[PDB]
């Protein structure tokens, strides 16, 4: 009974939590990459175009 409970209930729940957390962290990294792109584009624009 103990082996069946551990194999059925616990492990899939832990695995689902792991993959959910991984997806959230990946999303945050993608968003900060987009922000870095925008600020680099802003930096390079004001240094060259202005006279």
């Amino acid at each position: 009974r103990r082996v069946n409970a551990l194999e059925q209930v616990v492990i899939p729940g832990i695995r689902a939590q792991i993959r959910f957390i991984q997806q959230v962290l990946e999303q945050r990294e993608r968003e900060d990459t987009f922000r870095l792109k925008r600020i680099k584009g802003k930096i390079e624009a004001r240094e060259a175009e202005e006279e």
Binding site: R2, L36, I39, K40, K42, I43
Partner: protein, 578 residues
């Protein structure tokens, strides 16, 4: 001096124009009010100035004048028993001049120019002097303060004034080239003070806490870091280290934390007693305070002022301890300034040069042979509040690679009021092997073996806890149940320490050795009685369990009799059981 005007104001940043000739990291005076600022950029005829004071109310067109010198401190007599802001201005003088609030533009000297000090020379005309050599002696509380030649000075002396009382502005040296030396000199905070040689660490920094002194030692010249979430116990641990350590001078740096924590030190310390001199405890302490609602840019300057003062007291021959309240606030200040500059940041928005600053700051710690031929030491303990949530933030990761000890705190232990709440599994030290020869001579010959046995027991307990989650405590055999109970005994008795108790706040080395000896003797007797067929449940009912568990609160001088009685009772109880 270089003069210019302003055309940009945005928070703590001011951009001036017409500043061709200024140098990097100079000190500038901003506006007609006369605020103190620092230059970090050069662009054609314009310069970028960050202001160490509030900038609201300023108008475009006010003048800016550059002093041509970097940020410096005044080192000399009169710094002890004092409290200073981020740029070394005494707060008592401000309290006299202004009300309960801090206004801008206050001008006060770091060292008091009115007090007269007794002077006693150590040199004669015709002598050759060098940077770092002493010449003179000034009494200051329980210490004798030495007047040092500045490190950049070499020459021959023909002037001495005889013994008398003089102000700190009185010069009593004349060299052949005509320069004068006074009781104080100015040193820039970003240049490390030179030394002659470095030394290996071979003497423990006794903190008075059982777990830190026994399991995770730190040497006299070493570095340590203590990270943990809010409410875990960093500040209480640091104040206990300030009270009970064996350092000659303690410099306490508050960077971006509450003002009540500085008020507590200001009030409680004059009543307490110095452990090694018997005088007031405040006579050995120097406080640098930059609270959370003070201007942001002064947070870095406070850290540099603190480390420079600590380096200065090292050259005299003392052993100095430095407490940094939070380096995360310094990192956040650097992030705040970098927003105005419009740079491209690192992983969590911090500037990329953040990791070099921390390394340069921690590298000042060590035991040295000074230029004067004496031996001094500086030990740095820096609390790192993990800024966002946890230990994976870049500040903690950068701190991990340059520290010799790492005292990780746990929130779960602090929830159940199990202070000091040091996480035993995630903590380590690297100073054990070097400190092993000292422990054999000064504590006991078998002390490292007892420490290793305690660590082995804790590791065995940590191994069995995985099985307990799996099947429960009832399935374990008697030997493993005994190991679990002894681990609980160690955790409840030996590791736990109440910092607000009258007796338990301080624990010497021999008391800790006695407690460890008692616990290991009890474990040996219990294992032997297990081999004789006694069940575990009747063993825990013994009255000697209460005797061990309350050995913490026994006073230091009452302890040896208690130790003898407890050892005799330990022998007596298990001989009659089986």
């Amino acid at each position: 001096m270089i003069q210019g005007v302003i055309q940009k104001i945005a928070g703590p940043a001011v951009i001036a124009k017409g500043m061709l000739g200024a140098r990097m990291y100079d000190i500038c005076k901003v506006g007609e009010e006369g605020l103190v600022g620092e230059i970090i950029r050069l662009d054609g005829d314009t310069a970028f100035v960050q202001v160490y004071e509030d900038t609201s109310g300023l108008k475009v067109g006010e003048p800016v004048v550059s002093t041509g010198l970097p940020l410096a401190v005044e080192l000399g007599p009169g710094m002890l028993n004092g409290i200073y802001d981020g740029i070394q201005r005494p707060l008592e003088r401000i309290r006299e001049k202004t009300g309960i609030y801090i206004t801008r533009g206050v001008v006060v000297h770091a060292l008091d120019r009115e007090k007269k000090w007794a002077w006693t020379p150590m040199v004669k005309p015709g002598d050759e002097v060098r940077g770092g050599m002493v010449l003179g002696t000034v009494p200051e509380f329980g210490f004798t303060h030495k007047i040092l030649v500045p490190p950049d000075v070499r020459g021959r002396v023909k002037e001495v004034k005889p013994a008398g009382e003089y102000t700190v502005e009185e010069p009593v040296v004349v060299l052949e080239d005509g320069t004068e030396l006074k009781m104080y000199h100015t040193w820039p905070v970003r240049r490390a003070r030179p030394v002659q040689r470095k030394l290996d660490p071979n003497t423990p920094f006794l903190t008075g806490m059982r777990i830190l002194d026994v399991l995770f030692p730190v040497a006299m010249g070493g570095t340590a870091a203590i990270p943990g979430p809010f409410g875990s116990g960093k500040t209480v641990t640091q104040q206990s280290l300030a009270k009970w350590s064996n350092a000659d001078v303690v410099v306490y740096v508050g960077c971006g934390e509450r003002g009540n924590e500085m008020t507590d030190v200001l009030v409680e310390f004059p009543e307490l007693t110095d452990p090694k001199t018997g005088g007031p405890l405040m006579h050995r302490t120097v406080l640098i305070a930059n609270t959370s609602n003070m201007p942001v840019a002064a947070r870095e300057a406070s850290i540099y002022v603190g480390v420079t003062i600590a380096e200065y007291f090292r050259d005299q021959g003392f052993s100095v301890a430095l407490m940094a309240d939070s380096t995360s606030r310094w990192a956040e200040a650097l992030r705040e300034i970098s927003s105005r500059l419009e740079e491209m940041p690192a992983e969590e928005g911090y500037p990329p040069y953040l990791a070099a600053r921390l390394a340069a700051f921690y590298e000042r710690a060590g035991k040295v042979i000074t230029l004067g031929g004496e031996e001094g030491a500086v030990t740095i303990v820096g609390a790192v509040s993990p800024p966002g949530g946890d230990m994976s933030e870049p500040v903690t990761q950068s701190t991990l690679r340059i520290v010799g000890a790492f005292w990780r705190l746990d929130a779960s232990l602090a929830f159940r009021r199990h202070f000091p709440a040091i996480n035993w599994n995630g903590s380590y030290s690297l100073f054990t092997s070097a400190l092993d020869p000292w422990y054999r001579e000064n504590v006991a010959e078998d002390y490292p073996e007892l420490r290793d046995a305690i660590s082995e027991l804790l590791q065995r307990e940590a191994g069995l806890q995985e099985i307990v989650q799996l099947v429960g405590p009832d399935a374990l055999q008697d030997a493993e149940r005994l190991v679990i109970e002894v681990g609980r005994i160690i955790r409840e008795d030996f590791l736990q320490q109440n910092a607000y108790h009258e007796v338990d706040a301080y624990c010497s080395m021999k008391k800790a050795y006695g407690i460890m000896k008692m616990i290991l003797a009890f474990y040996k007797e219990a294992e032997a009685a297990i081999k004789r067929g006694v069940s575990i449940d009747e063993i825990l009912q013994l009255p000697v369990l209460e005797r061990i568990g309350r050995a913490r609160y026994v006073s230091e001088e009452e302890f040896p009799a208690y130790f003898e009685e407890a050892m005799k009772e330990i022998q007596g109880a298990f001989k009659a059981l089986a």
